[PDB]
């Protein structure tokens, strides 16, 4: 989950983009 | 979690900028 | 721009209101 | 849409709930 | 205090409302 | 705390939305 | 709406300026 | 009021201090 | 005021975009 | 300047990169 | 870090208000 | 660094001012 992936390690903009529509 | 809660607030702000016109779903 | 600024605040608000449910933001 | 509904006039908390999952 | 109650555990909107006027 | 400081920032944003026209006092 | 958006930023600002004193927000 | 005073023109830090406890 | 509010959001945005590089904000 | 460039019209992420170090 | 990342976001907001017309450089 | 100084201890407005132009 996004909480799982990005609150444990910092997610780049590119990583975050994966959760866009 | 509280730490997890604070982090989520920043996640959605970031998704907002990154996703732009596309938009997004936030599911925690 | 005015709309861009508003969306940022909308999203923070949805985040607090919806909680565990989560939300969708579609402009 | 939420931009239409909530950026021209202020949406109550109850209104915003319409956009929760 | 609000710092005591809501920074140790997550406070819901309903809990937070207690600190309104 | 610092963690406590960051949390307070989010508390006041939340009180702002929740309390609305009523307003609030922030006392830490 | 413009006023709603402004208040959000006011409140963050009061939070930093006032520190341990705290503050009141009354619109 | 603060909305009157600080949302029509920008309030300095010194001005905002008026609304501290 | 409208400009003041915009700058706040600009700065958050630069913060995310620039990352380790950092950024300068000059109005 | 960035205020001129990005507060009258919305600046893309690519545009904002111009203001990184 | 993450904690460090969240903190930086609040640092730049604070510098923005404090520095005003002067502006600032953010270098982490 | 500012991250070093102000994310370990809370920096006052006066301390933060040191990083202005
Ligand atoms: Cl935080
Ligand atoms: Cl705004
Ligand atoms: Zn804003
Ligand atoms: Zn935060």
CB J11 within 8 A of CB I14: no
Resolution in A: 2.1
How far, in Å, CA of K10 to CA of H13, rounded? 17
How far, in Å, CA of K3 to CA of J12, rounded? 27
CB B25 within 8 A of CB D21: yes
CB G17 within 8 A of CB G25: no
Closest CA to B13 of D19, C4, G2: C4
φ, ψ for residue B27, nearest 5 deg: -130, 110
Question: Who contacts I24 (Cβ-Cβ below 8 Å, separation ≥6)?
Answer: J19, J21, K23, K24, K25, K26
G touches A (3+ CB pairs < 8 Å)?
no
φ, ψ for residue B26, nearest 5 deg: -110, 115
Distance (Å) from the alpha carbon of K1 to chain G's nearest alpha carbon = 24
How far, in Å, CA of K5 to CA of K21, rounded? 25
Give the structural domain span for G6: 1-27
Is K4 an interface residue toward I (CB < 8 Å)? Answer: no
Q: What is the domain count for chain G? A: 1
């Amino acid at each position: 989950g996004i909480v799982e992936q990005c609150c444990t390690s910092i997610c780049s903009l590119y990583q975050l983009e994966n959760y866009c529509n | 979690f509280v730490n997890q809660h604070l982090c989520g607030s920043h996640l959605v702000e970031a998704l907002y900028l990154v996703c732009g016109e596309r938009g997004f779903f936030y599911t925690x």
